[PDB]
Symmetry: C4
Subunit: 33 residues, 4 copies
Amino acid sequence: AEIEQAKKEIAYLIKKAKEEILEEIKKAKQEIA
Amino acid sequence: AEIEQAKKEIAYLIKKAKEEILEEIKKAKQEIA
Amino acid sequence: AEIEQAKKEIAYLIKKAKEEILEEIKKAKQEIA
Amino acid sequence: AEIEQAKKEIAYLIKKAKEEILEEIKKAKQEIA
Ligand SMILES: [Yb+2]
Ligand SMILES: [Yb+2]
Ligand SMILES: [Yb+2]
Ligand SMILES: [Yb+2]
């Protein structure tokens, strides 16, 4: 089930990227405001 | 049509990530400026 | 060549998301600083 | 191994996008705060 495996891997990369970006926006906000 | 289904799922994850990130930038902007 | 087509479509979505997010960070920066 | 190649290409695009966005948040932070 390689198609599904590739999708799973991509989804995990998106989930990690999203979370790190949201964290960094929030932490910048907290530093400034 | 598994290839298309995987693409659809990935596209939805990107769309959600994009929207949440843009929202959080705008809300930070509004808090500061 | 459906695999390649799906990749092309995903790549375009990432490129649009990246560009919009970078634009919005820069415009927020310009408003504040 | 086209499925794996497409996954590799997508992963690289995500990695570049993530890194550029995180850099730009940090640099904005540094300019303001
Ligand atoms: Yb987190
Ligand atoms: Yb929204
Ligand atoms: Yb642009
Ligand atoms: Yb870097």
